Design a protein around this ligand. Sequence first.
Ligand code: SF4
Ligand code: SF4
Ligand SMILES: [Mg+2]
Ligand SMILES: [Mg+2]
Lengths: 450, 450, 465, 465
Amino acid sequence: AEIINRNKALAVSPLKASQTMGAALAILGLARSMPLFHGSQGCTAFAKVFFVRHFREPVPLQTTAMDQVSSVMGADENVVEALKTICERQNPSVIGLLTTGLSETQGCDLHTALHEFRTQYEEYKDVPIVPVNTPDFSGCFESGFAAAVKAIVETLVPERRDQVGKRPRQVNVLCSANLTPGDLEYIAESIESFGLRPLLIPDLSGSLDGHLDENRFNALTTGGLSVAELATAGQSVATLVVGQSLAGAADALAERTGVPDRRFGMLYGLDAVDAWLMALAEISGNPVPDRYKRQRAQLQDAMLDTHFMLSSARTAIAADPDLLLGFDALLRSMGAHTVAAVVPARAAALVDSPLPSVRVGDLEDLEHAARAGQAQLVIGNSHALASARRLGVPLLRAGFPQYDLLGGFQRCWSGYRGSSQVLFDLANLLVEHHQGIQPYHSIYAQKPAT
Amino acid sequence: AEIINRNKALAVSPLKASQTMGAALAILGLARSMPLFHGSQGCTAFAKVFFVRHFREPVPLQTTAMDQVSSVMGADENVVEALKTICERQNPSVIGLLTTGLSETQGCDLHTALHEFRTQYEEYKDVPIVPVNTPDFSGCFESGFAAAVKAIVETLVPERRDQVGKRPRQVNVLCSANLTPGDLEYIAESIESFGLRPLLIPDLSGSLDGHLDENRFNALTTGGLSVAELATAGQSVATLVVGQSLAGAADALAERTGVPDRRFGMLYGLDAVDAWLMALAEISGNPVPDRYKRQRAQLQDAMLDTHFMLSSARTAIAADPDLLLGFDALLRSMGAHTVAAVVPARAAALVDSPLPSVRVGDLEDLEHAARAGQAQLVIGNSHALASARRLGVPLLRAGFPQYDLLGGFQRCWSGYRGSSQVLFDLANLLVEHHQGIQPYHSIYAQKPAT
Amino acid sequence: HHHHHMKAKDIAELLDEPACSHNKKEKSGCAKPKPGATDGGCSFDGAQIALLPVADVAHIVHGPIACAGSSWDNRGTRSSGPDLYRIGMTTDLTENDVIMGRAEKRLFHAIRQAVESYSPPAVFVYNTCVPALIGDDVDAVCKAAAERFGTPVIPVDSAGFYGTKNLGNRIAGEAMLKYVIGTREPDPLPVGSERPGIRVHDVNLIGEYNIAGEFWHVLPLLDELGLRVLCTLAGDARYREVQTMHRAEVNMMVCSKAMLNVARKLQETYGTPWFEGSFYGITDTSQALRDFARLLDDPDLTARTEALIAREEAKVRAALEPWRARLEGKRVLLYTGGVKSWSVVSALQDLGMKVVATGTKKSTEEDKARIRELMGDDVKMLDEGNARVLLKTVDEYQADILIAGGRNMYTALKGRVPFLDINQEREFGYAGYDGMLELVRQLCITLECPVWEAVRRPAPWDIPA
Amino acid sequence: HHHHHMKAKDIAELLDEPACSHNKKEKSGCAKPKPGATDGGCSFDGAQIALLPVADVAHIVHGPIACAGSSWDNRGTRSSGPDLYRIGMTTDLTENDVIMGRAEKRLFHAIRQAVESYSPPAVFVYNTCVPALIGDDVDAVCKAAAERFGTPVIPVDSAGFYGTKNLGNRIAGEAMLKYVIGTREPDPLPVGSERPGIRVHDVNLIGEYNIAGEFWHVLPLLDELGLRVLCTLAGDARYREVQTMHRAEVNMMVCSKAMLNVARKLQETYGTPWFEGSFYGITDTSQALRDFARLLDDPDLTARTEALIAREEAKVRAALEPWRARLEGKRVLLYTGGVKSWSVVSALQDLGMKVVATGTKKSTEEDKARIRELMGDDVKMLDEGNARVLLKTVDEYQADILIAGGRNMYTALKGRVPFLDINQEREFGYAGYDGMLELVRQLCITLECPVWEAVRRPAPWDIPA
Ligand code: SF4
Ligand code: SF4
Ligand SMILES: [Mg+2]
Ligand SMILES: [Mg+2]
């Protein structure tokens, strides 16, 4: 696809979410973790509202509290004071040190401020701090997340090569931003069905899955990927990559451990799930279970029954590049055309797409592109509802944020059954909104006026 | 509950579906089976349209073709000619011989017409024929289904007592009409997770699950409960009964096998699923898996996050007694009140209900009752859409038929995850429809001509 | 019983149709069905299919829940106002009603309840198998109810066991001729409708059911020509329109031969000339409009009819040209399941598609005559209702798509073959010139679909080495 | 930098509020936050929370996506017409805009695009951290854009690092006083609104944000009394209403002290008398209406005010009586997170509920003064933002429900404790006499819920023998 780059001065109804938030989401996929924004209190407050409204769960998130004075005079002391405060009050398993636009503009070198804390408070030497440079003016929520998985891999995984296959059934999985806690459950369970032991990096299905913990109060993430388990990354037989956005994190993991990888997009549709199960069968040596063979025949049937409504359907998608490419492929197997594709920022994976072009814009740009292309349905987040209502078309919620849909944060989109439910939902919206031939009132009719 | 019995001459917008159809559905839950209605061609044609539109799959269904002459002079020969025709053309594993209102009015004794076929066509002695007296003027779809499982148990299960436990890990499951192919998959998988071996009687998740079979053409059911496997019901350690409607089939199985049973209503809500998993843990000796322990905490979270919208919510339900009692208990755990409850026909289980009264009636009665009670939502089949539009409230589809919703036939309402999704759907319907404080326009306002 | 011998006499009178060309033949459409090998609907289904689209009427089904409970709100018709016909109405007879003979009382109070609750222009009562077998005088109950409550109650005596769905359509037409037609004069031409130079002629459209609102493509053409449709039986129809059918100048038989008793009886009784035709395809829509001018003896109408045809044909041929390449030469297998399948054949001819039509021994003689007309006089009939024979026929002729009624949908879908529905349950309109555009869109939708290669390709584990 | 020293001088002038009683105290609300232990919002947030309900204005956020991208379309306000405030508008600065100093050019063309595409009455431009640090003269850009495009551009210089959300409310008020208020005379009284015996008085409602349309329960009462609200700042407000605020006769401070600079400056500049009050609860709504009559010096208004109070109090006390038993004696723990929590305390008093109010060292001095007023002079403050301390306080006082801002919702929900939201994000209105009914309904909804016993009871497998 030809990327129609950002051009206008004003972003109207922003599709994009900050890189800092995406990186915080990746940190949130680690057990007993605390994400820390190096910046003013407001960035963290907005991020907390964003995640609390989407997951409908408490979200750990702190700030270095950069004020007017520390923003000009220098804020490295605030970083040291925040690390010490979190280490003593909540005693974390891991801390994520993420930068904001304000800290990058000032010139705060992460590796200087972190070093100073390490030399002043040696009592917290064993608490790993993942440093990641994610200023708000660059990239997006998805690329930010992927940049945090790279920093996580470089900070909590040891640099070795001689241990590949030490845990013979173990298989790493590098997960992307748009993999919901329900998508992660399908990945882990499908892997487990082949006898393999999944190692999800990171694991949001343990922290933000939407469960009531045993403890009345938790200050850190109630679960997710443990740093103890993450150190056993070199010991695995293979690393599966789910989502093209993690190419940089897959290379970082491959160079540091030597564990060979197979790369995938979103596990949406007959061909993406076929290739997922084929790799698993080849890795474990065991055949594809009968359970997944039955679900393939069930997807083939849902494709037959929803072909009538989805073949030739014109859709408009406003989502992260992984979701765009993952939904386009699912729709392309059905004969449905993506007539409008809007991403929040550029992505290398977009260049290798069958779409004739993809725009880097906002929801206002989506509304105009969909209207030009005569879209019949929009696929986007809670913010896209107002654009869909102005267009007169139904919405199918997908991605962050989902503040207006209960349980939407945990929807499993992946696999045969998860892919089947997307076909039923797109078909059902399309049918419910289809207005047929309008009544014609004859000028000679014997119809009573009253 | 105190039953308000049918009193009006005209059933307007019928809730009830025939006893014959429900019995055919139970026969459809048997592998390579052909249901046969003893009556005119039209009963079968309407039943075929009913099931084809709900499941969106081909449905095996035959008729004895009773015409004007055979309806007055007698139609036992038509029964013999139909059994021979199906045995030679499709060679079935089992045939269901069900009667209509027309055959019962004439006085066709099933055990005479079947005997004559057995003495004329001895070449088909090994093809079991399940006889069931199902006239359209009596009972309903749910009780009719329950009658066919009783006849199935009496025809394909041997009359022994000395074999209880011969299959040590095998546990019988008596399934009711409203258990979707999705509910049946949760039942089988939950049982399998305890190391146990499920034996589903009948099994619609094998025939009408919505799968594309290997064969290009099938004349009978592509799967379900085999007669070979059904004969091993006496060798099972325990029999679980899912749905109060199958009390008569549970007694028939208990007298003939001696296998002890535990009875359940719908597997809906915190308490019904708790009791389901407790019985399984006690039977197998193994504890409740961590997977189901996590889903209980997820249900508790789903009940916390939806309490705001579901506590005190007034609902109107028009469904079979097993669905009514299953949904009332689910809603009662949330503080939601069923202010209107309409069933198609009487049931013993209704007498033992926490509701003050339940009406036997139709969808017109539902609209009248919901309007009196000030209902905010309606739970009911696709026919209940018009009642809900006339009432001005959302509808949550449940029960047969679901001709307007793709994939509705396979929804899993059962389990912790199944109960959470009902809560999110009721909460989302209630939120989307909630009209807040309406704008007041001041007579002194400085607002430009709005 | 002696009452049932006189009913079988009336059935033979309906099957004796002198207006049809196959009257001197062995009636194959209405032949004794094979037990354990039947697929069609009953006479009750047939009469309700023809009278349900009379939108404002109370449609009461007299019988147990098997009849109405499994069949209600499934008419592919569209209404422009009233929707009482969508409400399921049935006596829902209990065991005690059949045994104690309490069904006439139950029906009588059901008409009363319908009149009181909904105040309709009329009530149609449909008879079913159980009340026809038992002593149930539906006619006398309806007569008594009409008198006591002041609302016309018309009895359609069409129990399921009388015959096929086609017989029900005849009984429905008979009920209209006997109780409704001729009971009210047409309304005067609406004020403001006076178009100078246009002579308004009154016509009837018998057999048009407005499936998915398709007649709303033809209705504007008739309006432009100055043709007042007194009644479209029964597409978007009202009880008051049906009463005036006797005062039509010309009658049009739309894609039907089961309603031929209506056109014939209206010509014998009121002298109204009639013609057979269709609104499916360009050639058929234009021929239907040309036949109206031919029988109305108006040169001004004839000249304006040619002008409408030249305008609508220029517009539709231009719109079909960008699609012409995409559907040219595609093989179509048409199956006639007594669901008026031959009417859409003419539309497929206007696209350059070779169609292979096929039928069975249980099909009507008109279905058989149309197959000899196109395929040849030595054609082969499928005979039995075995769907595997129909699937084999698809592969035999290298068919690209199967066009048949909705019953055979899963035979084609599960057999991995593209299918197009042409029954009284579809959601797309194919009538008139505008309908041709929707037909090619639906044909391309299923034919150009990538879903077919996906369901034919095997699983990646079931691939040999 | 020397530009940043002059900005910190203006901030100290805003914190010096002589109209407040706690001016000679150590400003605890606006105190240096603890790193790694902070929960509040930034000045930009408070500025937007104050001016975003000016519904018809183009609210462009100048800065990177962290500011607007995470915060747009999340105002609990309801408008009666225009909704341009709901559209997210931001400069979405790139790295190159910050480095090359191209942000002023960016902002200038962003105002142009907003004016051309949406034609608003005015554009408001909110400064954020990044543009404030690199210098960006937001005022001069707005001034230039106002002149070149003909639409008023109002700069709201409130970068997040200046302080808390409360400071943003002061900066928002300052921006209105300096650029909007006093720029247009009120409209003449609408035609037909003449009511003999009624003298129409102009008032202003400062601090009413119409959360869930709750002000549409007070607006009819003001209307009945003959009080023209010139502007409700900013509930369901339009730019043209705000311009006329200088011509009000009386000003009402609604549940706020951050906007106290507005009421004081309007009394110093235009001589407009003001009063503090609330519309939460029966006693408060009636006191607010009584204060209006007291300052408007009209005996006819005073008499009609008593008549409205006697009517509305009789209706609401009668409606609250069937509920009176269900909420009597229920223990309420109120937490003050600077989200104007003390305003709803008076409503809970009208129900017979003993409330235990608590705050922290980071809370404002007014929050602390109201806690000494009810709990006692020797009260204990929580100090840190640790939520386990708040949970312990619930169990200590045997609290039945926690009433606090939406931030503390999951602390109470996860701690198995009933909660009621009282923040600028709720969907239920509690203002006026009518709002009291909704408050008791929401309190009963969560308190009488069986979900609480279910989440406290252990799993059936975690029960010993
Ligand atoms: S009329 Fe007869 S054949 Fe038709 S549905 Fe009723 S009982 Fe069945
Ligand atoms: S104003 Fe500052 S603290 Fe607030 S959101 Fe913007 S950058 Fe973050
Ligand atoms: Mg939650
Ligand atoms: Mg299917």
